[PDB]
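Summary for the steering committee. The consortium agreed at its last meeting that each partner would contribute one worked example illustrating the joint modelling workflow. Our contribution is presented below. We chose a case with several input lines so that the handling of multiple components could be demonstrated. No manual editing was applied between input and output; the record is shown as generated.
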Amino acid sequence: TFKRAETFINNYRQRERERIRLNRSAKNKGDIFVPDETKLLFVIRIAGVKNMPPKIRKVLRLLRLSRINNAVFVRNNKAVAQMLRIVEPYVMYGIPNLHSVRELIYKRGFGKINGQRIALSDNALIEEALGKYDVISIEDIIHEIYNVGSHFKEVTKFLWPFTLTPRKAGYCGEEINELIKKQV
Amino acid sequence: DHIIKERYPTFHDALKDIDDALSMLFLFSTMPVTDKIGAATVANCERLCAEFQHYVIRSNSLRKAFLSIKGIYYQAEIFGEQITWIVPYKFAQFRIMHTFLEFYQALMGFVNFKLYNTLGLRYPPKIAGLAAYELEESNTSLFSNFTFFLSREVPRFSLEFVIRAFGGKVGWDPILGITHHICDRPHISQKYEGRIYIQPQWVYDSIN
RNA sequence: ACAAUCUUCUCAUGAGGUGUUGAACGAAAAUUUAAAUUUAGUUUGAAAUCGAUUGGUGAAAUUUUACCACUUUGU
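What follows is the complete predicted structure of the assembly.
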């Protein structure tokens, strides 16, 4: 449709607002919050606003948030924090409680095997694809993801960016399970 | 209330016609939550299914348990009437369905309240699976008192609930959900002290 | 979508805090190295009829930064 001039200015203001927060938080504020209580999170994307800063665009892609509500098993450590804080305005990070991960895997589990949404319905699919990864079933997937097993990164690659379609632009902790409960 | 009274002249008619409602509730207890369905409705259906399983466990009304391809078929005798329910497996798989589910949930709640009153249990029960739902008071011996255990490959909680329903004490791994070791594979090594490798078919055959 | 993260302080006792519409008028000093910054000041409607500084830096896939600024642009 016909875009009105106010929308273009609103994009510029948000961009300048987005650019500023990025400049403060990253440069001269290298200190990071280091999320804890797990080795695995369930980050989701609230809304990637149009015309992102080019820094932002891969942060969704690399940690697998290329689409909205993409809940992914990410290795919880200091390393993800700065990248997530780069993308923190558009994401919610929270802990995948065992029930939430199991419930997600049991019903909404569509693991991105070969980059496609492959349902985790059959425990053999987890067993066959993750035989060397020690994940043998949906319950074992939770042990390898929610409990972040030895091959959690491989399990996460086996897993998918679960679209937990519904959110605050930051910490959730157990609130990711709340979204997962509604999503799954 | 009035619709259920007209549809079911007596509790015997409701019990005989609750097989479809029980099957629908069990199927919806593990179905994904979408726009067509409601999260609260799914939670209510799961609570009704848990209450029905707990009531069957206390009354030991379960008679047969068959491991079918579609799911677990449980046949129970309540007030003489035979009730058959199908429990689908936990696998990653509309207005009329929602209306039928709502009617089934209302019928299940009324049946659970009547069963709890007859057995003396409080309705609704206070709310780990069935462990959260406390049955506070207000084969029939398939595994008797054998303290069976389940690893993180068998139905675990489903095996525990099915055994506890008829006559058993099957276990469940903490993530998944001694005298026996329930596992998908034989897993002789996984069979712990006392826990002998328990194939689900063997337990189902003994129950049936 | 004329909506969004420009700072209730922070640490440590000191240090910081990252941030300013445009235009017009105007001292008189300094260093830095004429432009470059500071630099008495100012005036006005979020005012508006050329005048552009004109390099660098990356950072993607050479045109693209309409702030990317040397500490110099896609994790």
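The radius of gyration of chain A is 17 Å. The CA atoms of residues 111 and 159 of chain A lie 4 Å apart.
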